[PDB]
């Protein structure tokens with residue numbers, strides 16, 4: 292409550308210049324990012340507290356009920372937990388480029404993506420005995436070819452296949 | 468012309484309109500983009516030779 | 517318009533492979549296609565040379581490639597194994613057997 | 628799908644001229660193509676029937 | 677479907693593909709032209725975690741990261757390049773079939789109404805022209821004033837929209853003040 296600038300946040304020490312007449316900081320959207328102390332004449336930098344969004348990674352309710360929780364850009368150990376937070380504040384906490392993942396392991400293997408997460412990380416419900424794993428996306432099996440100055444590979448048999456395709460053509464009319 | 472369409476000539480109407488932030492600029496930018504696209508469209512259809 | 521009423525030469529437009537036909541079916545607010553394709557299978561590698569020299573001249577195939585199983589040479593199609601004996605009805609002479617690189621020696625048939 | 632994986636017979640679709648190949652390259656939020664074409668040059672007129 | 681890998685020893689009858697194939701020396705494993713393209717375009721916030729304007733967006737405006745990192749896209753591009761320079765276009769239908777490069781170019785001339793003997797007699801000249809064109813394209817891309825107009829524009833438009841949205845906060849809208857706290 293500096294002189295009436297009622298607010299909430301964290302106060303740190305800044306290296307701003309703040310010529311003697313100047314005593315407030317400002318930027319876009321009229322946010323006071325710095326302030327001069329009324330008594331000791333020390334400059335302080337104001338930063339908003341930690342905040343973010345959460346996401347729930349679950350398989351279908353038919354298959355099971357275990358879930359995992361992803362916090363958006365928190366860097367885990369920095370402020371993972373300050374009711375709903377009964378998840379041991381642990382149990383294989385993993386860190387990714389998108390945030391903090393709680394409730395999943397990290398297998399060194401590679402499979403096809405099931406539930407996209409972000410930055411080349413997926414999750415699934417594989418059976419080791421039931422758990423939620425968070426592997427790395429696999430682009431497919433690597434294959435080699437044997438280019439040479441004199442070599443051809445001509446097929447000797449064939450196959451006839453049928454492939455379906457679905458396209459919308461129109462939508463329901465309406466009047467108001 | 469937004470400021471002339473909304474307010475004819477009275478200055479206090481303009482003073483009140485400035486309290487609404489940057490709404491005229493968005494419309495002007497969109498209309499200019501539409502005009503430039505319209506000018507460009509009739510070029511690659513014909514100017515092939 | 518393009519696939520049902522005629523073959524389509526666009527790659528990966530109607531089905532994964534060489535397109536053959538199509539059949540339409542109706543559906544609530546939609547259409548369903550049944551693209552019928554043609555995919556080669558099974559393989560076998562061989563030895564090749566871009567041209568055949570007979571006597572101071574080249575011999576390029578009319579339509580196909582030169583394939584040798586180890587002793588003899590044949591002409592074949594590009595998508596199904598079908599060797600044939602080299603004759604004068606599969607080759608057209610163009611050159612003097614000095615500029616092409618990789619041309620091997622062999623004899624052709626005169627009917 | 629049409630130019631990288633096979634020759635294209637559409638006129639003035641992949642490059643100005645008779646198309647031969649193509650090579651893709653990535654870019655931030657975009658793709659870049661390197662169409663390789665074939666353009667005739669030099670002339671000589673003749674008589675025909 | 678399957679990530680192809682380039683042959684160990686690179687030689688294709690005279691054609692010089694070293695300007696488009698990946699370079700193992702670079703940490704990111706990207707072709708020189710890809711490196712030039714990356715250096716040409718400028719970005720401010722790429723969605724990476726960093727706990728001036730990019731950091732100011734804490735009013736609910738967040739940028740989520742893309743699913744595919746810009747490292748496996750290079751793998752896809754390299755797979756496409758290897759498949760299209762080793763096995764021709766036959767890998768677009770079923771299993772890839774090996775074919776030497778001069779034969780592929782012979783097919784490609786045969787496909788536009790030119791008989792194949794032309795290449796088998798002008799191979800050296802054609803290879804020299806191809807190499808010269810590939811060499812010149814990099815200089816043309818580097819020294820041009822601004823050829824990546826479209827990507828730059830699509831990058832700039834979103835930043836402009838976000839800046840306008842953020843700046844819209846400090847407007848009275850007819851109220852006493854634009855601060856929610858003092859009122």
Ligand SMILES: *[C@@H]1O[C@H](CO)[C@@H](O[C@@H]2O[C@H](CO)[C@@H](O[C@@H]3O[C@H](CO)[C@@H](O)[C@H](O)[C@@H]3O)[C@H](O)[C@H]2NC(C)=O)[C@H](O)[C@H]1NC(C)=O
Pocket residue numbers: 448449
């Ligand atoms: C090219 O591929 C096709 C299919 O992939 C091959 O046709 C298949 O040939 C096998 C062996 O000749 C057949 O198996 C036999 O089936 C009968 C029942 O019909 C069974 O009694 C035999 O004991 C044996 O298992 C198979 O049925 C047949 N497929 C079809 C759809 O008819 C074909 O042989 C291949 N071409 C070459 C040259 O190998």
Ligand SMILES: *[C@@H]1O[C@H](CO)[C@@H](O[C@@H]2O[C@H](CO)[C@@H](O[C@@H]3O[C@H](CO)[C@@H](O)[C@H](O)[C@@H]3O)[C@H](O)[C@H]2NC(C)=O)[C@H](O)[C@H]1NC(C)=O
Pocket residue numbers: 585586587588
């Ligand atoms: C490559 O293809 C050629 C052409 O088919 C193969 O040559 C042929 O081989 C068969 C079997 O070895 C010969 O048939 C047999 O000939 C003997 C006489 O040597 C005869 O006693 C048998 O009753 C039977 O008819 C065939 O004559 C021969 N033809 C030619 C033109 O060479 C060759 O074997 C193939 N090589 C490989 C490695 O696949």
Ligand SMILES: *[C@@H]1O[C@H](CO)[C@@H](O[C@@H]2O[C@H](CO)[C@@H](O[C@@H]3O[C@H](CO)[C@@H](O)[C@H](O)[C@@H]3O)[C@H](O)[C@H]2NC(C)=O)[C@H](O)[C@H]1NC(C)=O
Pocket residue numbers: 691692694695
């Ligand atoms: C394919 O093209 C590349 C260039 O895109 C060729 O690499 C180039 O090779 C020449 C000859 O060695 C290099 O020139 C020399 O480089 C050394 C430094 O290593 C320098 O000290 C010399 O004064 C001279 O400039 C050139 O730098 C090099 N290009 C690059 C980008 O490194 C390659 O040889 C070609 N290969 C084929 C098969 O065509």
Ligand SMILES: *[C@@H]1O[C@H](CO)[C@@H](O[C@@H]2O[C@H](CO)[C@@H](O)[C@H](O)[C@H]2NC(C)=O)[C@H](O)[C@H]1NC(C)=O
Pocket residue numbers: 439440441687
């Ligand atoms: C394909 O042709 C090339 C070009 O001649 C061959 O490359 C040479 O191979 C020999 C031995 O095979 C080496 O001593 C040379 O050093 C190679 N040339 C270069 C520039 O390195 C290649 O070997 C041939 N491959 C096949 C399978 O025949």
Ligand SMILES: *[C@@H]1O[C@H](CO)[C@@H](O[C@@H]2O[C@H](CO)[C@@H](O)[C@H](O)[C@H]2NC(C)=O)[C@H](O)[C@H]1NC(C)=O
Pocket residue numbers: 437561562563
């Ligand atoms: C078809 O390809 C296969 C695999 O590439 C070849 O099998 C081997 O090829 C290597 C490459 O030269 C040889 O060193 C081996 O001796 C081959 N092994 C066998 C068991 O053949 C195969 O030779 C190729 N077919 C032909 C006709 O060359």
Ligand SMILES: *[C@@H]1O[C@H](CO)[C@@H](O[C@@H]2O[C@H](CO)[C@@H](O)[C@H](O)[C@H]2NC(C)=O)[C@H](O)[C@H]1NC(C)=O
Pocket residue numbers: 619620621
């Ligand atoms: C193909 O056959 C011709 C003739 O049958 C070969 O030409 C001979 O080449 C040798 C060495 O180059 C010379 O000493 C002879 O005088 C040539 N004879 C004639 C009639 O020209 C030719 O070398 C063979 N090429 C291959 C690749 O087998």
Ligand SMILES: *[C@@H]1O[C@H](CO)[C@@H](O[C@@H]2O[C@H](CO)[C@@H](O)[C@H](O)[C@H]2NC(C)=O)[C@H](O)[C@H]1NC(C)=O
Pocket residue numbers: 672673674
């Ligand atoms: C190729 O075209 C050129 C220019 O059209 C021809 O050159 C002239 O053509 C006119 C038209 O008949 C003649 O009256 C002139 O006498 C030509 N001048 C010369 C110097 O040739 C040229 O003749 C044409 N080629 C052929 C084979 O007719």
Ligand SMILES: *[C@@H]1O[C@H](CO)[C@@H](O)[C@H](O)[C@H]1NC(C)=O
Pocket residue numbers: 353354
């Ligand atoms: C739930 O799963 C079981 C077995 O996997 C299946 O039989 C059942 O139909 C599923 N329920 C629904 C509503 O699909």
Ligand SMILES: *[C@@H]1O[C@H](CO)[C@@H](O)[C@H](O)[C@H]1NC(C)=O
Pocket residue numbers: 366369725
């Ligand atoms: C999280 O914070 C720790 C300690 O400051 C740091 O070592 C780590 O690099 C941070 N993680 C990220 C993704 O910035």
Ligand SMILES: *[C@@H]1O[C@H](CO)[C@@H](O)[C@H](O)[C@H]1NC(C)=O
Pocket residue numbers: 399
């Ligand atoms: C699993 O992956 C980690 C990641 O660096 C690595 O350090 C470890 O050696 C791997 N272990 C096995 C058994 O692959």
